[PDB]
Amino acid sequence: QNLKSTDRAVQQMLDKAKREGIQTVWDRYEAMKPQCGFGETGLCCRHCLQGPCRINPFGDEPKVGICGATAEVIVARGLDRSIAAGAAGHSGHAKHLAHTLKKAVQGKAASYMIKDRTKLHSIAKRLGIPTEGQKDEDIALEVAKAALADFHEKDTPVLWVTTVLPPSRVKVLSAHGLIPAGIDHEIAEIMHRTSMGCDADAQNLLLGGLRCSLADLAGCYMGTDLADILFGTPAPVVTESNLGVLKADAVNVAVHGHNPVLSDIIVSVSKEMENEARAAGATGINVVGICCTGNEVLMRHGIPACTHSVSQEMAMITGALDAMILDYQCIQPSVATIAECTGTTVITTMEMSKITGATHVNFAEEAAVENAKQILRLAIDTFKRRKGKPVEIPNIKTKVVAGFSTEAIINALSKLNANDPLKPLIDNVVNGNIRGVCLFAGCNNVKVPQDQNFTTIARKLLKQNVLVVATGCGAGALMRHGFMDPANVDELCGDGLKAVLTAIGEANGLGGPLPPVLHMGSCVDNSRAVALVAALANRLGVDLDRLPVVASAAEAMHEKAVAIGTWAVTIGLPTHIGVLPPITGSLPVTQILTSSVKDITGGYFIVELDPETAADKLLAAINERRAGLGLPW
Amino acid sequence: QNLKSTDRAVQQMLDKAKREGIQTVWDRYEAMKPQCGFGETGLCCRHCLQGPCRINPFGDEPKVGICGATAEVIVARGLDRSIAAGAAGHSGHAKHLAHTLKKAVQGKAASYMIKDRTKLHSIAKRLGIPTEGQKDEDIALEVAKAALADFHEKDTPVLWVTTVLPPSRVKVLSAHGLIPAGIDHEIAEIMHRTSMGCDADAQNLLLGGLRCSLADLAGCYMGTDLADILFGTPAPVVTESNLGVLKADAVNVAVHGHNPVLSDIIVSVSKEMENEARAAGATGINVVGICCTGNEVLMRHGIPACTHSVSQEMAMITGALDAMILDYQCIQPSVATIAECTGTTVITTMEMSKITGATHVNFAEEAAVENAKQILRLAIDTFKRRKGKPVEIPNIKTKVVAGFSTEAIINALSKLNANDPLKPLIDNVVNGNIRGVCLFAGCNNVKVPQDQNFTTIARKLLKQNVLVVATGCGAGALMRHGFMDPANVDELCGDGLKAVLTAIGEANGLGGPLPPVLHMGSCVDNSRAVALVAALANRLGVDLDRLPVVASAAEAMHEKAVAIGTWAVTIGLPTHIGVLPPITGSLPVTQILTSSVKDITGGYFIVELDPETAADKLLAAINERRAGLGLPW
Ligand code: SF4
Ligand code: SF4
Ligand code: F3S
Ligand code: F3S
Ligand code: FES
Ligand code: FES
Ligand SMILES: [Fe+3]
Ligand SMILES: [Fe+3]
Ligand code: NI
Ligand code: NI
């Protein structure tokens, strides 16, 4: 089962699923082989009813689509639609939060409030919204209105792009026409331009895709901003991860999906329902996280993470998962059928994300507490139904230190230099104790043995003194393998990196180092990494494409991960992807994305499926940046 | 060549392309056979990087997508993305017009103006915008602002839905949650909900698709409204169609694509450039239409239509097409390579729709006349380059009476009943002289011998006394086969229909009948048919799903045609589609779209590839509606 997942808890549950005859994602993948080579290479188009069209990667006809669309056009159009779909998931998440904040400050949703007043005022100042002599509720109303305005055209571009990147970067992007006019405007323009008989020039199509990827970045940054206002900006917190965080004696409730508008209330209401759970014979309600809504409540409240991404079904296989509470995105719909075998109650809550066979409980922000109690009472009832039934919870968990928002990283560094907090980080980049920075982001993917690329690449980079930060299910992979436990610094980190992590940790009163990898949060919280990198660029007076900073979507899966990788390139970063996106059917498109885009944005994709080789290529990219700054490497 | 097209002019040019070795759309289709059966049935998904996934229509595994997505989910998600893409093309067209009107009345684009003041005031009244004591430019500014506001969420739903359908229909749709909140909002929500791990219930997905199809309707209606304000509401006009409208002695300039913001200015500027063309040795500039921008200038100015849809390359094969001026949508990108063989200068004009190898001349509304002259001077130069070269223009053309906007139809009927113009139409439905109404809409499709379904179905319906109206390339097919020439009424029309067309025509001073088919305009002008049908419903006090009115997208191709067919169903019409959409891989989805949706909206799809059988099924649908009203049939 080591070929399927490198996580021992997942392996144990794969053995249980096999003997119980429960089909998993890995079984459905095996049943799909061999996969279509036209789809794999991007050489398929279904954009009109004359299709499906395909192009042979090599050989004879078909060589061109029925309408005349070339391989370059077909590949670029498919990629652009994936970017638009990712942007749509974001930003839809962000729009939900904006409406929640607006309702909260209008008196329509009293379960929500301004929890982080400092964040609210800082965002207002960033946007140009006046605060002096204004009520907090009025400031927040203007912030929410500004957020909603960024979805459509207006007299300003998308401010959640132009106010979050340094002016010099905005100027580079504007010169190429890449600043988005409105988030949903760009999504629609992509769908238009990629429809039949429209844009048919690869470079033009890809420029459109870069611009739409910045609409995705705006949605990510807006999501982080608004969630921090409503639920609190993360600070360092200690918890645990992996399936061993489930408790046979408790009502185990997974929050799964994406939006803290839902998961944050489940967490608080679950605490009030403790005695109601105890009357049912449980010790209490044990909320655990899956995927990014799990990351949200881990980062803010230390809620333990159960599992992530590709292995999500395995939480159910334990037999101890009483409920799985869903909003949207990254939920394998197989959970609804597996639930019938395991007993778990799967509950959907959002009108636009239902799963046949799963109970639907509308969750309205206006009734959030009451709707949460209805949901948790279904979980309690499910716990009672498994009285006396053995469960198999692998006794496997890691210690996780997390909560490294950009504010928290700056604060930790400020213990070494109070009035110039970024300088200690820069000093150690210059002296070589920190070679560079690598952000691990994105999903697991059934094609890659689970976590193998994240851990293989991270181990090589850490030994070479790279400061590693992580989000999403990349953070999930690293946390489940011990990379967020400071006890593992000696084993994992090069001497220079260990010295820096130790100096920061000891200055923060830990008597020990920061963890080997800094958890910066959910996938929208890739925007936090942007904030950190932009702050470094501004402090140094250079653009982001001169910094020794790289990204790796080492096991990418979702359209959202394609969008994030694309904006990482667009803001100036060398960006590794560890699975094949459907681009190899067009050499011209591949050449643009991996090479000539350097001349547009300074970033570029690094497509590399072998993780050892990917680590070497990421180190070369970091070291090239060091050399460009005149630094030893 | 009769297997490829039923149009003799197209056949002649297919022979020329064959002997000259110029590959056509039909050749590229032949090279594509056999097409992928997974794509044909809808049983393929590429919504994440674990794909491509497929499901065998019948047999053994694969039976389910890797994430667990069932056939029902995969089929519904693909269909929803096609609807969103169609909506994006519209409405993007509409947004362009809204920005043009705004610029015009702000003094920023003096080549544009309020040409139809009556239409402006009527739209303002419909929307609730006050007119008394307001400057026309201020009324128009408010109309343009309202149009742009319908793209995003606000305190009202999309007014280009709720103000254009009768209250009883809006109530039915609202009860099912189908009224769009914002045009681009719905497009983005579709892309979100159909991304991996989101909506996974076929009925829920399809309800979302119906709602997005109404966002498409709003874009269509907005496009017609704004184009009528800017360029004039059509009235009956006489012209010609088919390749014989080209003139060897003139500079032949095709306008191709969609937006009259471009084609209307080409038409007027071409007239000023006559003497500049004559100095180059031409008789003048002969502007001709292709596709819907051709329909726009045909409807408003009587510009002759050269060709449509699938046969567009054949205009170039004549050797006499000096320029082809493009904005966006439905342009085979093959035109850019064919141009090198024929001599034609292909010119793109819109930033988001370029074609490699075609000259790009930005067209800005602020410089429209100057940019038009630059474009036409390239055409003049091209004419000069073909001095002395034989051309082969098939000497084939039909007479076309067109210009039947809903205002024009009402006015024609008012000659029989001045103060109750719809009553003469209703009277003749009741007495059986008019059996019902059928709208032909949409594209040609290379899979269907060109025009064969439109003409076969239309002939059967006309003999059964159906009033036939048409738009887009369905109008194109019918016009090129003589269905818009009143001289053909005796041959084509049943006695009852002939009597009505004759009574209306003679009351309008024609000494003869209206044509066999009424041309209601471009594909956005399917909204005109909605206006007519809604007006009939309101006059009768019944909802649209009780009227003997049907639609037929008999040779559909573009995602826009899928969106239009879907909103035709959503507003209550039996809607034929004459090509297979990618739905047959899921019986549950097919059953919803062809049957159970009757219980939601009263409309339904009729999927039928055999045109004789489709005509019978359309007549049965009309006659069932007649029976429901208590009428003989
Ligand atoms: S858009 Fe072109 S390449 Fe795509 S399915 Fe249609 S004819 Fe084929
Ligand atoms: S969304 Fe599901 S069915 Fe589609 S490609 Fe991904 S794993 Fe396969
Ligand atoms: S929440 Fe989803 S977008 Fe990827 S990072 Fe995890 S599978
Ligand atoms: S303009 Fe296009 S949408 Fe169809 S009706 Fe003609 S091919
Ligand atoms: S031919 Fe397999 S993805 Fe289309
Ligand atoms: S397997 Fe052919 S359309 Fe995907
Ligand atoms: Fe996520
Ligand atoms: Fe059209
Ligand atoms: Ni992610
Ligand atoms: Ni059309």
Same domain for A305 and A220? Answer: no
Residue B15 placed within a domain: no
For residue A45 and ligand 6, the question of a CB distance below 6 A is answered with no
Pocket of ligand 4 contains residue B558 by CB under 6 Å: yes
Ligand nearest B32 Cα, by number? 1
- DSSP secondary structure string, A103-146? HHHTTS-TT-----HHHHHHHHHHHT---TT--HHHHHHHHHHH
User: How far does residue B522's CA lie from ligand 4's centre (Å)?
Assistant: 9
B562 CA distance to ligand 10 centroid (A)? 9
Task: Report DSSP state, residue B572.
Answer: T
3-state class (DSSP) for residue B605: strand
Q: Domain range holding B494?
A: 406-633
Give the minimum alpha-carbon distance from B369 to chain A in angstroms, rounded to a whole number.
24
User: How many A/B residue pairs have CB atoms within 8 Å?
Assistant: 321
Choose among B153, B193, B328: nearest Cβ to A148.
Answer: B153
If asked whether residues A395 and A351 sit together in one domain, one would say: yes
Gyration radius (Cα) of chain B, Å: 24
**Closest by CA position to A405, among listed A574, A261, A529, A545:** A529
For the CA of B560, the nearest atom of ligand 4 = 3
Atom 3 (ligand 6) nearest CA: B39
Q: How far apart are CA A453 and CA A555, in angstroms?
A: 7
My answer on whether omega of the bond before A52 falls inside 30° of 0, hence cis, is: yes
Chain B contact probe: residue of A25, A27, A48, A49 with most B CBs at under 10 A: A49
Chain-chain contact of A202 with B356 (C-beta, under 8 angstroms) = yes
Of A85, A183, A199, the CB nearest to B352: A199
Residue B544 included in any domain: yes
Chain B positions touching A216 (Cβ under 8 A) are none
Verify that A88 and A159 share a domain, yes or no.
Answer: yes
Q: Which residues contact B210 (CB under 8 A, 6 or more apart)?
A: B176, B178, B566, B567, B569, B570, B597, B600, B601
Q: How far apart are CA B334 and CA B342, in angstroms?
A: 12
Question: Is A36 marked within a binding site?
Answer: yes
What residue in B sits closest to A154 (Cα-Cα)?
Answer: B148
Asked if the structure places residue A465 within a domain, the reply is yes
Across the interface, of A49, A52, A196, the residue whose CB is closest to B581 is A49
Cβ of B36 less than 6 Å from ligand 6: yes
**B28/A333 Cβ within 8 A:** no
Task: Look at ligand 1, atom 2, and give the residue with the nearest C-alpha.
Answer: A67
B301: exposed, middle or buried (Cβ count in 10 Å: 0-12, 13-18, 19+):
buried
CB A4 within 8 A of CB A14: yes
Residue B305 is part of a domain; what is its CATH number? 3.40.50.2030
> What angle, 0 to 180 degrees and rounded to 10, lies between the N-to-C axes of helices B202-231 and B183-193?
150
**C-alpha separations of A43 from A38, A63, A273, A583 in Å:** 5, 10, 54, 8
- Name the maximum alpha-carbon separation found in chain A: 72
| Shared-domain flag, residues A189 and A265 | no
Omega of the bond prior to A34 within 30 degrees of 0, cis? yes
Same domain (yes/no): B489, B430? yes
In a domain, B40, yes or no: no
Please tell me whether B481 is known to bind a ligand: no
Residue from A599, A469, A583 nearest A536 by CA = A469
Q: Which of B234, B269, B286 is the last residue of a domain?
A: B234
Sign of the torsion angle spanned by Cα atoms B84, B87, B89, B92: negative
Specify the residue with its C-alpha closest to ligand 6, atom 4. B44
d(CA A1, CA A16) in angstroms, rounded, equals: 11
Range list of H helices, B69-135: 71-105, 117-127
Residues of B in contact with A558 (CB under 8 A): 48-49, 195-197
Give the Cα separation of B189 and A352 in Å (integer): 8
Residue B53 marked in a binding site? yes
Token pair of B304 as six digits = 């002759």
Q: Is residue A173 a contact partner of residue B534, using CB atoms and an 8 Å limit?
A: no
Question: 3-class DSSP state for residue B326?
Answer: strand
Distance CA A255, CA A521 (A): 16
Q: DSSP secondary-structure letter at B594? A: I
In chain A, what residues touch B445 (CB-CB under 8 Å)?
49-50
> Which of A489, A436, A423 lies closest to A467, judged by CA?
A436
User: First-to-last CA distance in chain B?
Assistant: 40
8 Å CB contact between B391 and B293: no
Tokens of B559: 């995602």
Task: Give the residue whose CA is nearest to atom 2 of ligand 2.
Answer: B67
CB A39 less than 6 A from any atom of ligand 6? yes
CA distance A487 to A465: 17
- B502 and B576 housed in the same domain: yes
How far apart are the CA of A204 and the centre of ligand 3, in A? 29
Residue B37 lies inside a defined structural domain of this protein: no
Q: Name the residue facing A201 among B200, B202, B356 (closest C-beta).
A: B356
Distance from the Cα of B463 to chain A's closest Cα (Å) equals 30
Ligand 6 atom closest to the Cα of residue B36 is 2
The amino acid occupying position B449 is P
Contact B189 A92 (CB under 8 A): yes
User: Are residues B175 and B70 part of one domain?
Assistant: yes
In this structure, the dihedral spanned by the alpha carbons of residues B500, B501, B504 and B509, taken in order and rounded to 10 degrees, is -140
* Shared-domain flag, residues B153 and B283: no
The answer to whether B585 touches B55, Cβ cutoff 8 Å, is: yes
Across the interface, which of B64, B333, B560 has its CB nearest the CB of A200?
B333
Q: Which atom of ligand 4 is nearest to the CA of B258?
A: 1
Task: Report how far residue B359's alpha carbon sits from residue B376's, in angstroms, rounded to the nearest whole number.
Answer: 13
Sorted by sequence, the CB contacts under 8 Å of residue B598 that are 6+ apart come out as: B604
Nearest to B189 among A36, A84, A352 (CB): A352
Same-domain pairing of A414 and A294? no
Distance from the Cα of B200 to chain A's closest Cα (Å) equals: 5
Instruction: State the helix-helix crossing angle for B368-385 and B260-272, rounded to 10 degrees.
Output: 60
Determine, for residues A557 and B49 on separate chains, whether the beta-carbon distance falls below 8 Å. Answer: yes
Answer whether A581 sits within 8 Å of B28, measured CB to CB.
no
Q: Is-contact A273 A373, C-beta < 8 A? A: yes
Task: Name beta bridge partners: B518.
Answer: B469
Q: How many domains does chain B have?
A: 3
Q: Is A291 annotated as a binding residue?
A: no
Query: Is the domain of A436 the same as that of A525?
Result: yes
Is residue A488 situated within a structural domain? yes
Closest CA–CA distance from residue A558 to any residue of chain B (Å): 5
- Ligand 4: distance of its center to the CA of B443 in Å? 4
Query: Of the residues A216, A234, A252, which one is the last residue of a structural domain?
Result: A234
Resolution of the structure, angstroms = 1.0
Say yes or no: CB of residue A74 within 6 Å of ligand 5: no
Please, which residues bridge with residue A254 across strands?
A288, A324
- Residues A393, A410 within the same domain: no
A44 lines ligand 5 (CB under 6 A): yes
- Nearest-Cα residue of chain B relative to residue A446: B50
Q: Are residues B75 and B204 in the same domain?
A: yes
Answer whether B28 sits within 8 Å of A67, measured CB to CB: yes
- Long-range CB pairs of A372-378 (<8 Å, 24+ gap) are A372/A265, A372/A266, A372/A269, A372/A270, A373/A269, A373/A273, A375/A266, A375/A323, A375/A325, A375/A347, A375/A349, A376/A251, A376/A253, A376/A266, A376/A269, A376/A270, A376/A273, A376/A285, A376/A323, A377/A276, A378/A323, A378/A345, A378/A347
Residue to mutate (ligand 4; options B309, B329, B559; most atoms within 8 A of CB): B309
Method: X-ray
Q: Which amino acid is at B532?
A: L
**Left (φ > 0), alpha (ψ -120 to 50) or beta: where does B600 sit?**
alpha
Residue B175 lies in a domain: yes
Asked which of B234, B259, B294 is the last residue of a domain, the reply is: B234
- DSSP-derived secondary structure letter, B346: E
Structure tokens at A328: 């949207």
Encoded tokens for A602:
């300074």
- Residue A133: which CATH number? 1.20.1270.30
Find out whether A426 and A532 touch, Cβ atoms under 8 Å: no
Would A335 be classed as within a structural domain? yes
Nearest CA in chain B to A185: B184
